[PDB]
Amino acid sequence: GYIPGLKPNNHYGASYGEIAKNCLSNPKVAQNPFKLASTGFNYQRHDFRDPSLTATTHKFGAQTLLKNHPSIDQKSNQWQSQTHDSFRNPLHKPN
Amino acid sequence: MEEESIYNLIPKEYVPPPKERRYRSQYPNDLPPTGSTFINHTTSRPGVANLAGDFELSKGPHSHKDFCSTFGRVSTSDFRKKNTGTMGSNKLPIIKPFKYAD
Amino acid sequence: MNLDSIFEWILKQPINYPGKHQDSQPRTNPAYKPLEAKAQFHIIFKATGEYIREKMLDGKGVNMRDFGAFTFEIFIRPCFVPDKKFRYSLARYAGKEEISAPKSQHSIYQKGFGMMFCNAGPIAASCYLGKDVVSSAHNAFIQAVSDLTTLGHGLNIDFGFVKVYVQDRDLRYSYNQNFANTLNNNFYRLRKSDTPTSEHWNTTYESKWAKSSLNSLLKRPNSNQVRNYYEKTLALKIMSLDLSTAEQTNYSR
C-alpha cells in the first residue's frame, strides 16, 4: 500500500527498500506552509492564486510553465552513479 | 496379454451399486448447548445455561423467545366480556390420583 | 459495391466486426423459421428502408447515430446531410453548407425540424427479431468508414427510395421523383393542432400498427400448419432410427 514518492516523480535504479526509506525520511509530505484545515474554513480564509502569470496578446501566447521542474541540478548520470567512498557506510550501525 | 474371440463382442455394461442410504441421524437438530450463557438476557438464569445436558431445556416464567418483542406494532364492538382476564373466573381444575412414590 | 458486396465484406471476417449479426438468431414468433446470417441482414435493411419513408412521409425526419441524416429544408426538399464521423472519412468532399442555421442551433437534432431516431423497436417487431441483434447489425454496417478510407470501393447504397453514390471520396445522391413530388403536394403534417386531441387514448396502438406500412413485407404463414409439420418431422426425427421391427405383418395386404 502506497509508498508516496515512487509514482509521481519516478525514482531511478535502486533497491525498493532503499528508495522507500529515502522517500519516507525526506522532508515535506506534511506541514502547512499555507495553514489550511481539512474541516473547511481556511479555504475561504485563503485566496487560491498561482503567482506565475504575466500578460499576453499581439505577441507570443504560450507562457512559461509551472515550477514543477528542477533547476541548477542538471548534472549527468555518471556523476550520481559513480563516486568512490563519500557515502554512508552500508554496514556501520554502531553497537 | 489379450486373446481374440467372438464372445468378446458386445462388451458388458457397467453395473455399480444403486445407491447408499441417504442418512441416519439420531440427534435432534436443535440441541441447546450445556453451558451456553449466550441466552440468559431478561431471564432468571444466573449467567449459566441448563448445564444439565438436557435435550429439551424446559422454560418457565421468563424464557428467551418472543415473536415481536422490540418493534411489534405496525374495535368498539369487540371487548372483554366476563372472565377473559387472567384473574377472573375464580374456578379450579379437576383432580388426579397422583404418583409421588416414583 | 452494390449494397450486397458490403454484406459480403462484413461477413467474411468475423474478427474485425464481432457481434450477434454474424450468426443466425431465433425468431420471436415460433411460427417463423430462423433465417441465415446474410438473409436476415438483408431483411433488416429492407424493413429499415420502409420505416424511413413512412416517418419521412410525415413532417418528421429521421437520422442515424453515425451515418448521415435524412432531413429536409423548408423555405420542402431533402438533402441527406452527412455526420461528422462520416465526414472525416471523406477527403476531397467539399464541406458546403446546405441548411442555413445560426450559432444557436448547433446539434444536428436542433437544426433539424422533426428529427427522429430510427428506433430498433419497430424494426425488431416487423422482422420478428430481437432488439439487440438489430442494433448490433446497424453498428456493424455503419462501419462503412473503414471500407471508405480505402482507395476506390465505390458505393451505391439503395435500401429503398434514396439513391446515394460514393466515389473515391466524393459524395453525391439522387432521389425518387415520385417521392419528391409526394412531399410537394397536403403537408396539416407540420402543425399539431389539427387533431381534435381526443383519439390519443381512444385509438389503440394495434389499430395504428395494423394500417402501418410495416408488417406487410413478408407473407404470414399458417401457424398451425407449420407447427404440425415441425412436430410431425420431429416425430420422424427421433424414432425413425429402426426400420426392421414390424409387429404388424399384413402378408396378403
Binding site: - | 442418512y23 440441541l31 450445556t34 453451558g35 451456553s36 450463557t37 449467567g47 448445564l51 | -
Partner: protein, 436 residues
C-alpha cells in the same frame, strides 16, 4: 533435529499464528527482532520452531497465506517486521469474498504454486521433519478453499508425512456470515480424507470459557487466540523440553485414531482461572484433571456425556508426579458419569513435561506451576455434524445463494456429493459406538 512446519491460511489462521508465534518467541527468549535478548548474556531447544541463519537472528519455520493484502501489510508494518522472511508472508491481490468456488478454482490457483515453492524451500532445509500444522477458518471462502488446495497438493507431493489440522467450524447458533454452511461442508469433504488429525476449535465454547472463568464481560479475538496458542504450546512442548514421559508427534495418531476414517476429535485445557481467584484453591492434579474432564470446559461446543469415549490423550506440564496421575486416572475410571466404549479397556495415554507454562504480559491467565491439556476422541462429536447438516438442508432446498457458486466454475453436483460425504461420516460414528 526435529522440526514442525506451521501453515497459516486465512485471516483466522493469521491472527491465531500471531499469538502462537508471540508465545513461542517469549517462551524461548527470542526478541521480536529475532535475536537473543540483547547483550545481557544456548540450549538448542529452539531448533524445533526456529533455525539459525548463520549470522545472528533466527527465522521461524512458518508461512502465511492470504488474498487480502490488509492483514499481511499491517503485520509487516507491526513490531514483528524484522522477524519473518520478507517473502514468507505471501499475500494476494483480491479477496475470495467468502466464496469457496473462487478460492478453490479461480484465484487460489495462481498462488498455490508459489506457496508450494516456499513450502519445499522450507522442507528441504530440515532433516528430521516431524510433520505439518495447518490453521484455517472453515467459515471463510479463501480460508477453506486454499486450505483444501494446499492439503490436496501436499498429500500427493509428500505422502506419509503427518498433517495436523486445527479447524474452526461455525458455532451452533451464533455466527457472523450467512453462507458459511456451504463452504463448511465443502471443506469438510476436502479435509476428511486428507488430514490425519482434526482438532475442533469452535468460538462459542471459548467465549463460554472466558465468561465463566476469566470473569471478562468484554472479550475479543485476542483472548481466544491466546488460549489456542497455549493449547498448541502444551501439545508441542514434549518435542523440545525434557520430561519424565515423552510423547512425539507420531505418537498421537497411533493412539487416538482407532480407524482411518474416524479422526475428528476435540480438546480441553485446565486450569483456566483468573488471578482474582486463581490460587485460592489448591490446584492439585486431581482437581485440575477433574476440571479438564468437566463437560463445560470443552473447547468445542459438544457434550461428551451424550456418547461413548474412544481414547484420551492428556499431557501434564509442570511439577507433576506419575503416582498422582495414576491416582487421578483411577478416580476418573471409577467415576460413573464418564463411560468408555466396551472394546477399549485402557484408553489413556499420558505424557509428562517439566517445563512450566509461560506467561505473556497483558494476558488473562495466571502463572501456574501445574497444567494439563487433554484431547479426546468420542462418538458425541456427531451432534455438531447433525446440526450443521440441518442448517444446510434449509437453504439448499430453495436454491438459495447457489448461483454465486455455480457462476464461478463449480459443477452443480458438488453439493449433493458433499451432503453424501457428511452422511457417510455420520454413518461411521454411530455404527462403531454401539456395543457388540
Amino acid at each position: 533435529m526435529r522440526e514442525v512446519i506451521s501453515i497459516h491460511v486465512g485471516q483466522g489462521g493469521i491472527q491465531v499464528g500471531n499469538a502462537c508465534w508471540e508465545l513461542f518467541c517469549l517462551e524461548h527468549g527470542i526478541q521480536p527482532d529475532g535475536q537473543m535478548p540483547s547483550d545481557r548474556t544456548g540450549d538448542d531447544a529452539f531448533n524445533t520452531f526456529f533455525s539459525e541463519t548463520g549470522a545472528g537472528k533466527h527465522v521461524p519455520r512458518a508461512v502465511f497465506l492470504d488474498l487480502e493484502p490488509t492483514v499481511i501489510d499491517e503485520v509487516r508494518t507491526g513490531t514483528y517486521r524484522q522477524l519473518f522472511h520478507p517473502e514468507q508472508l505471501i499475500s494476494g491481490k483480491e479477496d475470495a469474498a467468502n466464496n469457496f468456488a473462487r478460492g478453490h478454482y479461480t484465484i487460489g490457483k495462481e498462488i498455490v504454486d508459489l506457496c508450494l515453492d516456499r513450502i519445499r524451500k522450507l522442507a528441504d532445509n530440515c532433516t528430521g521433519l516431524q510433520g505439518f500444522l495447518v490453521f484455517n477458518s472453515v467459515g471463510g471462502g479463501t480460508g477453506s478453499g486454499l486450505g483444501s488446495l494446499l492439503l490436496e497438493r501436499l498429500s500427493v507431493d509428500y505422502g506419509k508425512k503427518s498433517k495436523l489440522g486445527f479447524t474452526i467450524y461455525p458455532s451452533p447458533q451464533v455466527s457472523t456470515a450467512v453462507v458459511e454452511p456451504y463452504n463448511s461442508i465443502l471443506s469438510t469433504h476436502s479435509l476428511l480424507e486428507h488430514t490425519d488429525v482434526a482438532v475442533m476449535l469452535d468460538n462459542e465454547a471459548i467465549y463460554d470459557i472466558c465468561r465463566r472463568n476469566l470473569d471478562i464481560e468484554r472479550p475479543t479475538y485476542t483472548n481466544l487466540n491466546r488460549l489456542i496458542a497455549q493449547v498448541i504450546s502444551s501439545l508441542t512442548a514434549s518435542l523440545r523440553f525434557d520430561g519424565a514421559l515423552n510423547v512425539d508427534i507420531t505418537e498421537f495418531q497411533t493412539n487416538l485414531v482407532p480407524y482411518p476414517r474416524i479422526h475428528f476429535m476435540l480438546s480441553s485445557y485446565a486450569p483456566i482461572i483468573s488471578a482474582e481467584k486463581a490460587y485460592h484453591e489448591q490446584l492439585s492434579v486431581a482437581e485440575i484433571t477433574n476440571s479438564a474432564f468437566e463437560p463445560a470446559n470443552m473447547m468445542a461446543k459438544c457434550d461428551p456425556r451424550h456418547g461413548k469415549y474412544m481414547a484420551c490423550s492428556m499431557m501434564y506440564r509442570g511439577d507433576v508426579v506419575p503416582k498422582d496421575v495414576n491416582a487421578s486416572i483411577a478416580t476418573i475410571k471409577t467415576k460413573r458419569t464418564i463411560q468408555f466404549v466396551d472394546w477399549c479397556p485402557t484408553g489413556f495415554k499420558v505424557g509428562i513435561n517439566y517445563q512450566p507454562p509461560t506467561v505473556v504480559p497483558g494476558g488473562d491467565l495466571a502463572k501456574v506451576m501445574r497444567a494439563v491439556c487433554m484431547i479426546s476422541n468420542s462418538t458425541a462429536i456427531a451432534e455438531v455434524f447433525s446440526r450443521l447438516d440441518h442448517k444446510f438442508d434449509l437453504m439448499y432446498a430453495k436454491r438459495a445463494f447457489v448461483h454465486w457458486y455455480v457462476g464461478e466454475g463449480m459443477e452443480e453436483g458438488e453439493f449433493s456429493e458433499a451432503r453424501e460425504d457428511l452422511a457417510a461420516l455420520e454413518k461411521d460414528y454411530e455404527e462403531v459406538g454401539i456395543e457388540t
